[PDB]
Design a protein around this motif. Structure first.
Motif, PDB file in Angstrom:
ATOM      1  N   UNK F  26       0.960  -1.134   0.055  1.00 58.58           N
ATOM      2  CA  UNK F  26       0.036  -0.049  -0.035  1.00 58.58           C
ATOM      3  C   UNK F  26       0.943   1.160  -0.050  1.00 58.58           C
ATOM      4  N   UNK F  27       0.079   2.471  -0.094  1.00 59.46           N
ATOM      5  CA  UNK F  27       0.796   3.862  -0.019  1.00 59.46           C
ATOM      6  C   UNK F  27      -0.117   4.650   0.678  1.00 59.46           C
ATOM      7  N   UNK F  28       0.741   5.899   1.363  1.00 55.88           N
ATOM      8  CA  UNK F  28       0.048   6.797   2.004  1.00 55.88           C
ATOM      9  C   UNK F  28      -1.273   7.562   1.381  1.00 55.88           C
ATOM     10  N   UNK F  29      -0.898   7.791  -0.181  1.00 54.90           N
ATOM     11  CA  UNK F  29      -2.023   8.406  -0.889  1.00 54.90           C
ATOM     12  C   UNK F  29      -2.791   7.223  -1.401  1.00 54.90           C
ATOM     13  N   UNK F  30      -3.592   6.744  -0.491  1.00 59.55           N
ATOM     14  CA  UNK F  30      -4.447   5.744  -0.659  1.00 59.55           C
ATOM     15  C   UNK F  30      -5.460   6.168  -1.710  1.00 59.55           C
ATOM     16  N   UNK F  31      -5.558   5.153  -2.689  1.00 59.03           N
ATOM     17  CA  UNK F  31      -6.580   5.228  -3.924  1.00 59.03           C
ATOM     18  C   UNK F  31      -7.975   4.491  -3.500  1.00 59.03           C
ATOM     19  N   UNK F  32      -8.079   4.228  -2.471  1.00 58.97           N
ATOM     20  CA  UNK F  32      -9.130   3.468  -1.845  1.00 58.97           C
ATOM     21  C   UNK F  32     -10.437   4.307  -1.866  1.00 58.97           C
ATOM     22  N   UNK F  33     -10.322   5.627  -1.570  1.00 57.34           N
ATOM     23  CA  UNK F  33     -11.570   6.724  -1.360  1.00 57.34           C
ATOM     24  C   UNK F  33     -11.617   7.230  -2.904  1.00 57.34           C
ATOM     25  N   UNK F 157       3.909   0.543   4.127  1.00 63.13           N
ATOM     26  CA  UNK F 157       3.179   1.588   3.415  1.00 63.13           C
ATOM     27  C   UNK F 157       4.203   2.575   2.952  1.00 63.13           C
ATOM     28  N   UNK F 158       4.193   2.693   1.464  1.00 63.22           N
ATOM     29  CA  UNK F 158       5.012   3.513   0.727  1.00 63.22           C
ATOM     30  C   UNK F 158       4.717   4.954   0.964  1.00 63.22           C
ATOM     31  N   UNK F 159       5.792   5.960   0.663  1.00 67.83           N
ATOM     32  CA  UNK F 159       5.609   7.334   0.714  1.00 67.83           C
ATOM     33  C   UNK F 159       5.930   7.946  -0.616  1.00 67.83           C
ATOM     34  N   UNK F 160       5.868   6.971  -1.607  1.00 68.58           N
ATOM     35  CA  UNK F 160       5.912   7.560  -3.036  1.00 68.58           C
ATOM     36  C   UNK F 160       4.766   8.254  -3.389  1.00 68.58           C
ATOM     37  N   UNK F 161       4.753   9.280  -3.861  1.00 68.40           N
ATOM     38  CA  UNK F 161       3.640  10.257  -4.542  1.00 68.40           C
ATOM     39  C   UNK F 161       2.884   9.346  -5.806  1.00 68.40           C
ATOM     40  N   UNK F 162       1.781   9.577  -5.639  1.00 63.31           N
ATOM     41  CA  UNK F 162       0.891   8.873  -6.726  1.00 63.31           C
ATOM     42  C   UNK F 162      -0.024  10.095  -7.333  1.00 63.31           C
ATOM     43  N   UNK F 163       0.069  10.143  -8.752  1.00 66.04           N
ATOM     44  CA  UNK F 163      -0.603  10.990  -9.290  1.00 66.04           C
ATOM     45  C   UNK F 163      -2.226  11.236  -8.916  1.00 66.04           C
ATOM     46  N   UNK F 164      -2.759  12.601  -8.663  1.00 73.53           N
ATOM     47  CA  UNK F 164      -3.970  12.475  -8.118  1.00 73.53           C
ATOM     48  C   UNK F 164      -4.858  13.615  -9.192  1.00 73.53           C
ATOM     49  N   UNK F 165      -5.968  13.068  -9.802  1.00 72.33           N
ATOM     50  CA  UNK F 165      -6.891  13.720 -10.511  1.00 72.33           C
ATOM     51  C   UNK F 165      -7.886  14.477  -9.784  1.00 72.33           C
ATOM     52  N   UNK F 166      -7.939  15.895  -9.959  1.00 70.92           N
ATOM     53  CA  UNK F 166      -9.305  16.440  -9.365  1.00 70.92           C
ATOM     54  C   UNK F 166     -10.428  16.418 -10.342  1.00 70.92           C
ATOM     55  N   UNK F 167     -11.546  16.314  -9.988  1.00 74.17           N
ATOM     56  CA  UNK F 167     -12.783  16.243 -10.842  1.00 74.17           C
ATOM     57  C   UNK F 167     -13.895  16.747 -10.288  1.00 74.17           C
ATOM     58  N   UNK F 168     -14.587  17.737 -11.044  1.00 72.75           N
ATOM     59  CA  UNK F 168     -15.687  18.518 -10.844  1.00 72.75           C
ATOM     60  C   UNK F 168     -16.874  17.588 -10.825  1.00 72.75           C
TER      61      UNK F 168
END
Ligand SMILES: *[C@@H]1O[C@H](CO)[C@@H](O[C@@H]2O[C@H](CO)[C@@H](O[C@@H]3O[C@H](CO[C@H]4O[C@H](CO)[C@@H](O)[C@H](O)[C@@H]4O)[C@@H](O)[C@H](O[C@H]4O[C@H](CO)[C@@H](O)[C@H](O)[C@@H]4O)[C@@H]3O)[C@H](O)[C@H]2NC(C)=O)[C@H](O)[C@H]1NC(C)=O
Ligand SMILES: *[C@@H]1O[C@H](CO)[C@@H](O[C@@H]2O[C@H](CO)[C@@H](O)[C@H](O)[C@H]2NC(C)=O)[C@H](O)[C@H]1NC(C)=O
Ligand SMILES: *[C@@H]1O[C@H](CO)[C@@H](O[C@@H]2O[C@H](CO)[C@@H](O)[C@H](O)[C@H]2NC(C)=O)[C@H](O)[C@H]1NC(C)=O
Ligand SMILES: *[C@@H]1O[C@H](CO)[C@@H](O[C@@H]2O[C@H](CO)[C@@H](O)[C@H](O)[C@H]2NC(C)=O)[C@H](O)[C@H]1NC(C)=O
Ligand SMILES: *[C@@H]1O[C@H](CO)[C@@H](O[C@@H]2O[C@H](CO)[C@@H](O)[C@H](O)[C@H]2NC(C)=O)[C@H](O)[C@H]1NC(C)=O
Ligand SMILES: *[C@@H]1O[C@H](CO)[C@@H](O[C@@H]2O[C@H](CO)[C@@H](O)[C@H](O)[C@H]2NC(C)=O)[C@H](O)[C@H]1NC(C)=O
Ligand SMILES: *[C@@H]1O[C@H](CO)[C@@H](O[C@@H]2O[C@H](CO)[C@@H](O)[C@H](O)[C@H]2NC(C)=O)[C@H](O)[C@H]1NC(C)=O
Ligand SMILES: *[C@@H]1O[C@H](CO)[C@@H](O[C@@H]2O[C@H](CO)[C@@H](O)[C@H](O)[C@H]2NC(C)=O)[C@H](O)[C@H]1NC(C)=O
Ligand SMILES: *[C@@H]1O[C@H](CO)[C@@H](O[C@@H]2O[C@H](CO)[C@@H](O)[C@H](O)[C@H]2NC(C)=O)[C@H](O)[C@H]1NC(C)=O
Ligand SMILES: *[C@@H]1O[C@H](CO)[C@@H](O)[C@H](O)[C@H]1NC(C)=O
Ligand SMILES: *[C@@H]1O[C@H](CO)[C@@H](O)[C@H](O)[C@H]1NC(C)=O
Ligand SMILES: *[C@@H]1O[C@H](CO)[C@@H](O)[C@H](O)[C@H]1NC(C)=O
Ligand SMILES: *[C@@H]1O[C@H](CO)[C@@H](O)[C@H](O)[C@H]1NC(C)=O
Ligand SMILES: *[C@@H]1O[C@H](CO)[C@@H](O)[C@H](O)[C@H]1NC(C)=O
Ligand SMILES: *[C@@H]1O[C@H](CO)[C@@H](O)[C@H](O)[C@H]1NC(C)=O
Ligand SMILES: *[C@@H]1O[C@H](CO)[C@@H](O)[C@H](O)[C@H]1NC(C)=O
Ligand SMILES: *[C@@H]1O[C@H](CO)[C@@H](O)[C@H](O)[C@H]1NC(C)=O
Ligand SMILES: *[C@@H]1O[C@H](CO)[C@@H](O)[C@H](O)[C@H]1NC(C)=O
Ligand SMILES: *[C@@H]1O[C@H](CO)[C@@H](O)[C@H](O)[C@H]1NC(C)=O
Ligand SMILES: *[C@@H]1O[C@H](CO)[C@@H](O)[C@H](O)[C@H]1NC(C)=O
Ligand SMILES: *[C@@H]1O[C@H](CO)[C@@H](O)[C@H](O)[C@H]1NC(C)=O
Lengths: 114, 105, 108, 123, 123, 445
Positions: F26-33, F157-168
């Motif tokens: 896993x990663x800090x920047x969870x993609x779970x949400x 749990x990894x600290x590597x940044x994962x690209x996040x897309x913000x959506x309207x």
């Protein structure tokens, strides 16, 4: 101490496609825009167009866009100008220049008659 | 496109004198006007990046100023070598329109 | 059809009035009464539109007006070339779109 | 065929041909943050639909009314409005009269409904 | 601006003829068009009207059961198909611009640009 | 003459503030949400639309800030609370095979730790960096003992940044500014509409912004108010500058059970010799990079002034030093070697600039107080390579008669890092209902 060399041929007058390949030395392409400036005898300067070194994206002077292509190859540290349907008005000194806001480096423009 | 012109087509001048010229634009340029010196047979030598900023190797004899649409170039004294034409260039938009003018004699 | 008197004439330099008469539904209800002229052998030309409007290319000697269920075209300064047949036309409504009147043959 | 808001910047008379393009994109813890956004989108959709209902435009994207246009809202002719303006420009020009126009539209529809109810009672 | 008419000439009663009008010097698609006819010894009579898009047509009662008006904007052409021609239909037919405009345009209840016509004879 | 006509689906909008949601591929920047992203974005070019953007008044920045902090904290909820460690430590210096720079940097500590059973204790000997340990003369305590409880980050749990897309959300749209040389705070003649932003990596750093986007033509200088010396200046480079960072010491990591299913990770020993952590940039690239930055600064600070670069003036290590996460380790690199020059208009090998670095295991992020994280040590040797894509600079105040301006590295406020990626986006609300006059009258009966 960047140097630019235009390396242009003489051309056929009534109709041909111009091709000028400018060699670049003493620096590189990734941080700069490159382009061509023309000066017909007795006239001031006009911009033809330019290319971004890092991405290859170009822009051209609206007056001749349908006839002009600018491209580059950083492998040989070169870029070039291609102009179609050359006809009399295209007689000019063609200069190679490096742009970083201003035009910092200029070559030795070549007179090409048409 | 942004058009611009220089005021004098030429100036008469003594060597031991201060001469000035101007460049005027049809559209507002936010200090993004460059100046060059041209001798017959040669590519123009850059003088100024922005109206008030000198390039490398350019002597203190040259200076300039301006913002908006109204710009100036000043030469405090001339050497025989400074009797040349001058160009102004806007780089605020893509037709990289140059002005033409001020041959100094 | 709209009533339009035949053979209305006058001398060069004079003015002439060519009237048009309709009903309450045709002229009385709408301000759309145009005038046309036709030289023999040619398609009609628009001279006046709406009631008082004049298209580009038509001189100011031509002007119209209306009252009640009638309308008219007047020509001032009659010229040698003003010998066209004239017609009135009006917008009558949605069920009947256009009604033309009879013609007037102007002579000088 | 242009995409969503592709006609923004085109004239009003051109943009009006894409009304379904924009209409179909309306309505299309931390879970709470997302639900609030979804609920809100629904509430806004419904409020616009309610006004169209009140004004008698419930099933239409283009609806003609009986409220005369006031020259005081905009003393401008049709050629200028439909051919030389975009909807964004128009919206700014008359934003001050929005609630006057809306009030008038509501009143007109109320009168129309009463008249229809009575005509249907003529026997 | 020019309007040029071509088309059929003499037919026997009960037959069919078609007329065509081509036009240029203006945007064809911006205008509604109409056919007007003139019997050899008479004044002008309105026959038919088509809108700019081509979807709406109107006719004078006399030809409702026999004439069709249509247009094709891509070829700048207006046309009229006449069936069951009667002797009473002998006339010079003309194409003209105007007689109607859309809701977003200024009113245009008049004809302005006329072609020179074509003669239709039924005998 | 004319009548009101109502239209629905009208392409107009208003500035608006709404709630955005995240999306990802896993990663800090969870993609779970986060909502899985679409196969491809769409972009609609809006011809003839000129719109005004303001990056300094952009609520997308505040939402990203809140979301990043939230994800950070959620990732620590199930991790071990290292409260048994806040004990007196007995410490001496590591003097075994230490080089000249590593003097007093490591301490060898011994303490009585809890274990699985409550009636038992164990003696533990571990190495600590000096920056994490404060003297109480061999008696020391951990630096966080008088302000907070510390949580061990979970080792998996990894600290590597994962690209996040913000959506309207529906009913909203994101407008993107495509202009080159766009500094924010202006009209933007070339815009387009997107539903989601590009992926943005939540890279956390001070002074030098790593792994962001690049300018295409020129270095871009951006600020809220350039003449206000209290503001930060963000600089976007048009070329990357590569930086090579390492933690050369080969560590052996040990662990102990400190409770019923809980364990603590610590550095046991160092296998080889002990050297200082460091980062390299080439001289040629860095020197070219500054020349480009200086030329652009001269636009705002003209009349042939002197542009000088200098070291950060003071404050906590986080602001004065270049902070970043390298392979899970937390580095604090000294940039005094990068910002030590004077530039004037009269100017002009594998040689490189080595930046010495310090390392810490007790981290207090987002400028908060009362929370702390313990970063477990990493076994082996760490090396990472990053791209410098931008700078944060501040300017000295002074008299107005000055002919010299001085710039220093700045940072510490994470929102300004975000702003460098979100500067081109604006959120607007679609307002589909509107009216205009026409010649169409409703039929009256
Ligand atoms: C700026 O951007 C760069 C480039 O993206 C970042 O640098 C990368 O950082 C990651 C994370 O530290 C590095 O990934 C690690 O690589 C190790 C070596 O892998 C080799 O073997 C694999 C075999 O599958 C090959 O595919 C690979 O190419 C190598 O040859 C792995 O061992 C690591 O995995 C271990 O740790 C992770 C936790 O981090 C666990 O989840 C794993 O299970 C395992 O235990 C990991 O994959 C990557 O190599 C770096 N790239 C470069 C070029 O150096 C910078 O960090 C970023 N800068 C900033 C500030 O964010
Ligand atoms: C943006 O504005 C330009 C004009 O500045 C529009 O260009 C017109 O395009 C049509 C295409 O059918 C041509 O027939 C017109 O002659 C063009 N106008 C001019 C003045 O040259 C362009 O269509 C507009 N873009 C959008 C999306 O509406
Ligand atoms: C850290 O301290 C421990 C204990 O003080 C060191 O381990 C000892 O090493 C010596 C050799 O120098 C042995 O004689 C002891 O028996 C060891 N004790 C135990 C139980 O470990 C360790 O080497 C030190 N490490 C460093 C790098 O200083
Ligand atoms: C917790 O302990 C630390 C370390 O003693 C305190 O930090 C010091 O505060 C003084 C204030 O005069 C400074 O001069 C020192 O330089 C600080 N030292 C370090 C290492 O930062 C801290 O204030 C204490 N916190 C509380 C809440 O009492
Ligand atoms: C970013 O670009 C904008 C647009 O050119 C600059 O805004 C102008 O600033 C001057 C000085 O305050 C005002 O007089 C103008 O009216 C502003 N223009 C517009 C359209 O509002 C802005 O200053 C630039 N930012 C930086 C740091 O250079
Ligand atoms: C940018 O910041 C400067 C410095 O605070 C502002 O300039 C001040 O403006 C006030 C109000 O007019 C004056 O009383 C001060 O004397 C000015 N100070 C200086 C040093 O000039 C400037 O107005 C701000 N820019 C904008 C757009 O708000
Ligand atoms: C940063 O640069 C230094 C050189 O200035 C590198 O150190 C050298 O590494 C080689 C092995 O590759 C040794 O043989 C040399 O003796 C070292 N020189 C010095 C002065 O220490 C260092 O490895 C580079 N660091 C990174 C992360 O690339
Ligand atoms: C960072 O490390 C990379 C290697 O991972 C360096 O790139 C090498 O540079 C040498 C010398 O020019 C070449 O012979 C190698 O072929 C390159 N290797 C690769 C994979 O490209 C890079 O120069 C280092 N950068 C810094 C600032 O230290
Ligand atoms: C980063 O490294 C530099 C260089 O070693 C340190 O600079 C010293 O700062 C003090 C206080 O201003 C001066 O008296 C010294 O003369 C400076 N050293 C040199 C060689 O000039 C700087 O303090 C270090 N900063 C941090 C946060 O570690
Ligand atoms: C650059 O150096 C020359 C040396 O001859 C000097 O005359 C000139 O004034 C210098 N220019 C600047 C801006 O310092
Ligand atoms: C226009 O508004 C004025 C008040 O400013 C009002 O008196 C007038 O009756 C209105 N006209 C129409 C057609 O609504
Ligand atoms: C609309 O008003 C403008 C400005 O008075 C005028 O130039 C234009 O011709 C008018 N349009 C029409 C169709 O009359
Ligand atoms: C709308 O109201 C504002 C004041 O809130 C005023 O400044 C503006 O001029 C008004 N707009 C029009 C078209 O009158
Ligand atoms: C650790 O190093 C410091 C350096 O200032 C020295 O004063 C101290 O006595 C050393 N302690 C031990 C145990 O060697
Ligand atoms: C562990 O506890 C004993 C109690 O007698 C004490 O003497 C010893 O110093 C403690 N050990 C450490 C490393 O603090
Ligand atoms: C650094 O820039 C190069 C440019 O060619 C790119 O290929 C590389 O992926 C970039 N590295 C990072 C971490 O973005
Ligand atoms: C430390 O130095 C001694 C003496 O040179 C050597 O025997 C020992 O192996 C070295 N230890 C390490 C880890 O290099
Ligand atoms: C620019 O520098 C000159 C000296 O070369 C000085 O006289 C002039 O006042 C300066 N201009 C400004 C705006 O500071
Ligand atoms: C800055 O440059 C000067 C001159 O070369 C040098 O003496 C000084 O030590 C340098 N400062 C730093 C922090 O490297
Ligand atoms: C860095 O740039 C300055 C510019 O004046 C030059 O004098 C110096 O030699 C350059 N150093 C390197 C390593 O390129
Ligand atoms: C650290 O030392 C161990 C000794 O067993 C070795 O296996 C490992 O590869 C070394 N790590 C590195 C990065 O060289």
């Amino acid at each position: 101490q960047v140097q630019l060399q235009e390396s242009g041929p003489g051309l056929v007058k009534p109709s041909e496609t111009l091709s000028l390949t400018c060699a670049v030395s003493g620096g590189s392409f990734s941080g700069y825009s490159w382009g061509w400036i023309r000066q017909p005898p007795g006239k001031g300067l006009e911009w033809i167009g330019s290319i971004i070194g890092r991405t290859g994206s170009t822009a051209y002077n609206p007056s001749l866009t349908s006839r002009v292509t600018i491209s580059r190859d950083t492998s040989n540290n070169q870029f070039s100008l291609k102009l179609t349907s050359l006809t009399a008005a295209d007689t000019a000194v063609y200069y190679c220049a490096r742009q970083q806001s201003n035009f910092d480096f200029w070559g030795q423009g070549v007179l090409v008659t048409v | 496109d942004i058009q611009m012109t220089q005021s004098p087509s030429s100036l008469s001048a003594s060597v031991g004198d201060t001469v000035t010229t101007t460049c005027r634009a049809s559209q507002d340029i936010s200090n993004d006007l460059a100046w060059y010196q041209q001798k017959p047979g040669k590519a123009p030598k850059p003088l100024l990046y922005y109206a008030s900023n000198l390039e490398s190797g350019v002597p203190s004899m040259f200076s300039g100023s301006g913002s908006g649409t109204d710009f100036t170039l000043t030469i405090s004294s001339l050497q025989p070598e400074d009797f040349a034409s001058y160009f102004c260039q806007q780089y605020n938009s893509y037709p990289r329109t140059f002005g033409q003018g001020t041959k100094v004699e | 059809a709209l009533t339009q008197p035949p053979s209305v004439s006058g001398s060069p330099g004079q003015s002439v009035t060519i009237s048009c008469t309709g009903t309450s539904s045709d002229i009385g209800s709408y301000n759309y009464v145009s005038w046309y002229q036709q030289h023999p052998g040619k398609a009609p030309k628009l001279m006046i539109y709406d009631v008082t409007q004049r298209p580009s290319g038509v001189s100011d000697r031509f002007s119209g007006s209306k009252s009640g269920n009638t309308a008219s075209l007047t020509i001032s300064g009659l010229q040698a070339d003003d010998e066209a047949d004239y017609y009135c036309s009006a917008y009558a409504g949605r069920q009947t779109f256009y009604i033309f009147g009879g013609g007037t043959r102007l002579t000088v | 065929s242009l995409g969503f808001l592709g006609a923004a910047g085109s004239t009003m008379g051109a943009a009006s041909m894409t009304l379904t393009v924009q209409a179909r994109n309306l309505l299309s813890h931390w879970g709470i943050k997302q639900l609030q956004a979804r609920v809100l989108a629904v509430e806004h959709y419904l409020r616009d639909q309610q006004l169209l209902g009140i004004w008698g435009c419930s099933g239409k994207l283009i609806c003609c009314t009986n409220v005369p246009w006031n020259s005081s809202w905009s003393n401008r002719n049709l050629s200028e409005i439909w051919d030389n303006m975009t909807w964004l420009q128009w919206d700014k020009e008359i934003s001050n009269y929005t609630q006057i126009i809306y009030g008038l539209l509501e009143e007109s529809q109320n009168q129309q409904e009463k008249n229809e109810q009575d005509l249907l009672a003529l026997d | 601006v020019q309007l040029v008419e071509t088309g059929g000439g003499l037919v026997q009663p009960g037959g069919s003829l078609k007329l065509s009008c081509r036009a240029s010097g203006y945007t064809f698609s911006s205008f509604a068009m109409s056919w007007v006819r003139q019997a050899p010894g008479k004044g002008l009579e309105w026959v038919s009207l088509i809108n700019d898009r081509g979807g709406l047509t109107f006719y004078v009662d006399s030809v409702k059961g026999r004439f069709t008006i249509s247009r094709d904007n891509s070829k700048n052409t207006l046309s009229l198909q006449m069936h069951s021609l009667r002797d009473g239909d002998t006339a010079v037919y003309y194409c003209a611009t105007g007689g109607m405009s859309s809701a977003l345009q200024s009113s245009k209840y008049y004809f302005d640009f006329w072609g020179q016509g074509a003669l239709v004879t039924v005998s | 003459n004319l009548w009101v006509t109502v239209y629905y689906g009208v392409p107009v909008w208003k500035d608006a503030e709404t709630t955005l949601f995240c999306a990802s591929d896993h990663n800090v920047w969870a993609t779970h949400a986060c909502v899985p992203t679409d196969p491809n974005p769409q972009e609609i070019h809006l011809e003839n639309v000129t719109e005004e953007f303001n990056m300094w008044k952009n609520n997308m920045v505040e939402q990203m800030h809140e979301d990043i902090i939230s994800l950070w904290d959620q990732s620590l909820k199930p991790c071990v609370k290292l409260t048994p460690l806040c004990v007196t430590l007995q410490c001496t210096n590591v003097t075994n095979n230490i080089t000249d720079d590593m003097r007093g940097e490591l301490k060898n500590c011994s303490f009585n730790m809890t274990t699985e059973l409550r009636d038992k204790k164990q003696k533990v000997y571990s190495l600590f960096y000096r920056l994490d340990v404060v003297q109480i003369n061999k008696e020391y305590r951990l630096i966080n003992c008088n302000t907070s409880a510390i949580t061990q980050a979970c080792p998996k749990v990894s600290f590597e940044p994962i690209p996040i897309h913000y959506c309207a959300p529906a009913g909203f749209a994101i407008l993107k500014c495509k202009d080159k040389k766009f500094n924010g705070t202006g009209p933007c003649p070339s815009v387009s509409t997107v539903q989601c932003t590009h992926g943005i990596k939540p890279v956390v750093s001070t002074q030098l912004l790593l792994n962001g986007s690049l300018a295409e033509e020129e270095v871009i200088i951006r600020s809220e108010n350039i003449t206000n010396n209290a503001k930060n200046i963000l600089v976007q480079l048009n070329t990357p500058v590569q930086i090579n960072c390492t933690r050369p010491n080969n560590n052996t990591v040990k662990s102990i059970r400190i409770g019923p299913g809980q364990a603590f990770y610590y550095t046991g020993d160092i296998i080889g010799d002990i050297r200082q952590a460091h980062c390299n940039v080439s001289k040629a690239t860095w020197n070219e990079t500054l020349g480009k930055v200086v030329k652009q600064l001269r636009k705002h600070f003209g009349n042939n002034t002197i542009i000088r670069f200098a070291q950060s003036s003071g404050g906590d290590l986080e602001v004065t030093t270049h902070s970043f996460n390298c392979g899970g380790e937390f580095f604090y690199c000294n940039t005094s070697g990068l910002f030590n020059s004077t530039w004037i208009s009269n100017t002009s090998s594998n040689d490189s600039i080595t930046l010495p670095c310090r390392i810490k295991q007790i981290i207090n992020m987002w400028q908060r107080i009362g929370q702390a994280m313990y970063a477990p040590p990493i076994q082996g040797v760490i090396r990472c390579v990053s791209n410098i894509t931008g700078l944060i600079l501040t300017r000295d105040g002074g008299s107005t008669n000055s002919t010299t301006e001085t710039f220093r590295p700045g940072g510490g406020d994470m929102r300004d890092n975000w702003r460098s990626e979100l500067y081109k986006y604006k959120v607007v609300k679609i307002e589909p209902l509107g009216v205009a006059p026409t010649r169409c009258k409703r039929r009256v009966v």
